[PDB]
Amino acid sequence: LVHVASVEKGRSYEDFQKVYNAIALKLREDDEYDNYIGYGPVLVRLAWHISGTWDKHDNTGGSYGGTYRFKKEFNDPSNAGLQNGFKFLEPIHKEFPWISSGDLFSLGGVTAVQEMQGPKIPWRCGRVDTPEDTTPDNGRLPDADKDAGYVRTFFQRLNMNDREVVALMGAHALGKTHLKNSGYEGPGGAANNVFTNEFYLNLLNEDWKLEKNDANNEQWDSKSGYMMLPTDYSLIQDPKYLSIVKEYANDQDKFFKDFSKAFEKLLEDGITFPKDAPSPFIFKTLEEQGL
Ligand code: HEM
C-alpha cells in the first residue's frame, strides 16, 4: 500500500494557519466542556486514535485516509467519547471545506498541544480522503488493563521504540478517564489542561494503591485524588521504561523535544511525501500572534 501526500489545490502556509487559528479560537470559546477542562485533551486523543490504527507491515490504517468519518471506525468501542472531538471540529470543516479529513483531525491534535502550552509540533499537509472500504477494522487500538511487555509489543506495530513510547505516554497528564467511555475513572494530576511533564513526576512521587472502580476494573489510585491505568503504572515496573521516566521527570525540555518528534512521527506514519512537497509548517500560537 503506497499513500502519497497531495497538497490541497493551491493551498499554502497561510491557509492552514487560518484553520489553526479557527480551532484555537474555538478552544478558547468552548471552555466549559468536561467540567472546564475544555476540548484540548479529547482533540489530542482523537489525533492519536486516527493514527494509532496504522500497521507497519502492510501500511494499512494510519492518519492518511481520514476513515474515522466512516461508521465502522466511528463506532469502534475503543473510540467511545471521541464523538465530542468530531462534533467540535465539524463547524471548522464547514468553514474550510477544502481541507481533507485526515489533515483536519491531525491538525486539531497539533493545535490543542501548542495552545495548552506544549512544544511546537512540525505538521505536514497532504492527507487525502479514501473510500469507506479502506476503513481499518476494530481492534487495532491498545487495551488499558495490561502490562509493560504488552505496551512494548503493541507499539512495535507502529514502530515506536521505548523512548518514543514513554515520551508519547506523557500526554496522559492531560484530561481524564471517564467511566462511561472506558470503565476507568479519574484524572492523573492537577494540571490536566496545561501540557507539562507531571505524568512522570506523579508516577514517581505519589503513593499508589491498586483499587477496583465502579465498572469493576482495577486501577492505581492515590491519596491526592489521581489515578493511573495498569498500562500507565507499567512504566515504573519495567527497568528500561523506568529509567526514561526518571529522565523526563528530571528534564522538562528533553520531554518536550522528544514528545514533539514522536507525535509528528505518529501523525505521519504511512505517508509518502514527494521531494517537491513543502517543508513542515510550524504554526504560531494565538498568543504569539497577539490574537
Ligand atoms: C497503551 C497506550 C494507551 C492506552 C491503553 C490508552 C488508554 C486510554 C484510556 C482508557 C483513556 C480514557 C478514555 C476515556 O474514558 O475518556 C485514555 C485517555 C487519553 N489518552 Fe490514552 N492511551 C494510550 C496511549 C495514549 C497516547 C500515546 C496518547 C497521546 C499521544 C494518549 C492520549 C490520551 C489523552 C489526551 C486522553 C484524555 C482524553 C480525555 O480527557 O477525554 N493516549 N487513554
Curated annotation (Swiss-Prot):
Record PTM text: CCP1 precursor is processed by the rhomboid protease PCP1, which cleaves the N-terminal hydrophobic transit peptide. The m-AAA protease (composed of YTA12/RCA1 and YTA10/AFG3) is required for CCP1 maturation: m-AAA protease promotes membrane dislocation of the CCP1 transmembrane segment within the transit peptide to ensure the correct positioning of CCP1 within the membrane bilayer, allowing intramembrane cleavage by PCP1.
Q: Which domain of life is it from?
A: Eukaryota
Give the sites modified to Phosphotyrosine: Y150
Does tRNA processing show up as a keyword for this record? no
Q: Which reaction does it catalyse?
A: 2 Fe(II)-[cytochrome c] + H2O2 + 2 H(+) = 2 Fe(III)-[cytochrome c] + 2 H2O
Positions bearing the site annotation: Transition state stabilizer: R45
Keyword Metal-binding attributed: yes
Example GO biological process: hydrogen peroxide catabolic process
Annotated TM spans: none
Cite the cofactor comment: Binds 1 heme b (iron(II)-protoporphyrin IX) group per subunit.
General function of this protein: Destroys radicals which are normally produced within the cells and which are toxic to biological systems.
UniProt name for this protein? Cytochrome c peroxidase, mitochondrial
Natural source organism: Saccharomyces cerevisiae (strain ATCC 204508 / S288c)
The upper taxonomy is: Eukaryota, Fungi, Dikarya, Ascomycota, Saccharomycotina
Chain's gene name? CCP1
